[PDB]
Every structure is written in C-alpha cells, then in structure tokens.
Design a binder for these strands. Structure first.
Ligand SMILES: [Mg+2]
Ligand SMILES: [Mg+2]
Length: 294
DNA sequence: CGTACACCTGATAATGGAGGATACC
DNA sequence: GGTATCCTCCATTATCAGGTGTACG
C-alpha cells in the first residue's frame, strides 16, 4: 500500500532506466533493442519489491540479482509503454534521473512504431542510449561511430512535488544515523548523536538546497573528495521538532521504516536526558545494534 | 560537561550492465 | 526465420554510512 508520490520519490533515489542494444544476426539490423525498468535492493527489502509489483499492476518480475540482492524488473516494451510511461508522465521524477527517464521514453516511442527494426531508428536509439546513465559501451561506440549523443534534457529548478515524494526519496537515499562517539568530557565517556542525512550527487544541488527551507533545518556539506552532498541535520531540537514529526506523518517505506522507529526510540531516551547515564547509554547501544538487520 | 557543526573515509547494496533460453508470430 | 521476453548471472563502484575534532556556551 504505496502512495504514487512515494514511489516516484523512491525511484528518484534507486530506480534504473536501461536501454540495451545487443548484437545478434537474427535481427535484420544485426541488433536487438531492449528497454528495462529495474529496482534492485537487498533481500531485507524483498517485501517492498512485492508491493511495487502489486502497485504496477502485477507486472514484471522479481529475481535474484546478486548474492544478497533481488531486482524487480519490467522488460516488456509493451508493458512499459502501457503502465510505466503513463505513471511517470503523470507523476514526474525531479532528480537527474528524470533526464534518463525522458530519453528512455523516446526509445520506447520509437520501439512502439517499430522504428527500432530499421536502420535510421536504430541509429536514433543509439543516440538516445548515448546520453543515458553511463553512455555507450566500447562495443556500441565502435559499431556506431557516426551517432552523435542526443542533447540531455535541460529541465530547470524542480520543486518537491508532494511531501510523500520526500518520504520515498529518503527511503532510498536518506540515513537515520545513531552515533556513539568517544568523549573526554561527557561523564559517561560517550556522546550520543542523532544525525539525519540525505545523500546525492552535486548536480542536484538545487534540490538539495531546497531541503533546508522545505524541512526548516539542516545544512549542506560537500564531501571534499568529489561531487557529493550530504544534507545533514545534527541539531537535536530540529530532529525532535521537525524531522521526526515529518516522517511520522509521511512514512518511510522498506525496512528502513524499522530503523526510523528505532532512531525515534533513541531520541526519546535523549529527550529524557537518559543518554547521559550508563543505563540509558546501554539502551541506546542495544537499539543501535539492532538497526539495519531487517 | 555537553552539544553541534566541521571535517574524514571505506565496504558494499546498488549501479547498470551481461548473455543464453524460451516464447511468440 | 525474425522478433520479444524471460531468466540467470556479475564486475565494479558511488555512495551511504560510520566515523573523529573542536569551538563554544
Ligand atoms: Mg540512490
Ligand atoms: Mg540509494
């Protein structure tokens, strides 16, 4: 029982829009063109993959991916055009994932009129694929030297469309951190810190910036090493006053919801000042130990 | 004593594929 | 045949995530 804007928020965090162009001499052009919508998570979130499937009309399938991950995927061109496109055309992505989605859609529209089974459409598809995710492989790059990449979508400053979007997004790219930090001055030897965090690539700077006014707190840290921003809340009265109540009403999805509850329990012990006693520190240690376990 | 932001860093849950088998027309 | 989808498998990595230092009241 997922809400539409939560699903969009989650796919803004974790979805993959893929176009594969595979060599095969049984096709008249020599290539097979396939579009895939894919969501891949640890098995701990297998129940959220099942909800997603049910949400998307029972379509697609859920399969072992890696050692301990499972993917939900839709690989039918037809089913993609019928269910996925009208969903995201109505409830639009707001990160740079939107750019990949829009180029993915164009490929699908070209597959819909069968233009992919022609030389000219295949070339267009290769140009579209060229600006999606990591771009052309060495194989396609060499087989398609003429194909100029299609300009990436310039979509400007997108607002958070609905608070449920933020719930979904934080479900994928948010962290509810409990830290126990050695302290020379705290009477129990340790500081208990709750940190709320959202991690994104720097190109979505405007979005990340808008979280501060949206949530009425936080600040953006930039990783000194690369293009990575961490929207961060460390002020405990903001945690209590703004973050916890937001997510109480707009609930996180997946097993991360259990983690948020645990984190909430730490805050309670902290609101009571019991984190500054050995017993309270130990409760927090137990809650924390329990986090991220399914 | 205690909090809060400034600053640091790495293991791995996702990123984003791959190719062979089977079904459809 | 030609075309479409299903299924199984995975190499590498961009983050999440798990910190520590220190100024300030
Ligand atoms: Mg993400
Ligand atoms: Mg994520």
């Amino acid at each position: 029982k997922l809400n539409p804007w939560a699903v969009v928020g989650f796919i803004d965090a974790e979805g993959s829009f893929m176009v594969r162009v595979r060599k095969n001499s049984k096709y008249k052009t020599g290539w097979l063109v396939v579009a895939i919508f894919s969501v891949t998570v640890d098995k701990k979130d297998l129940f959220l993959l099942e909800s997603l499937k049910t949400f998307f009309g029972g379509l697609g399938s859920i399969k072992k991916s890696g050692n301990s991950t499972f993917s939900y995927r839709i690989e039918s061109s037809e089913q993609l055009t019928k269910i996925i496109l009208p969903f995201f055309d109505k409830y639009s992505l707001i990160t740079e994932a939107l750019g990949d989605y829009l180029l993915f859609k164009k490929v699908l529209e070209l597959m819909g009129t069968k233009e992919h089974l022609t030389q000219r459409g295949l070339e267009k598809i290769v140009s579209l694929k060229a600006s999606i995710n990591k771009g052309l492989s060495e194989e396609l790059q060499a087989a398609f030297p003429q194909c100029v990449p299609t300009p990436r979508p310039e979509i400007n400053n997108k607002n958070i469309p609905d608070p449920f979007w933020l719930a979904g997004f934080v479900s994928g790219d948010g962290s509810f951190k409990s830290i126990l930090k050695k302290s020379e001055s705290i009477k129990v030897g340790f500081q208990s810190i709750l940190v709320f965090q959202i991690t994104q690539h720097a190109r979505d700077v405007k979005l990340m910036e808008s979280l501060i006014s949206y949530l009425g707190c936080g600040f953006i840290e930039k990783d000194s090493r690369g293009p990575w921003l961490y929207y961060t809340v460390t002020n405990f009265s903001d945690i209590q006053g703004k973050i916890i109540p937001f997510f109480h009403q707009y609930k996180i999805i997946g097993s991360a919801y259990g983690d948020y509850q645990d984190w909430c329990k730490i805050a309670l012990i902290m609101q009571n000042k019991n984190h500054l006693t050995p017993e309270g520190l130990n409760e927090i240690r137990a809650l924390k130990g329990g986090m991220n376990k399914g």
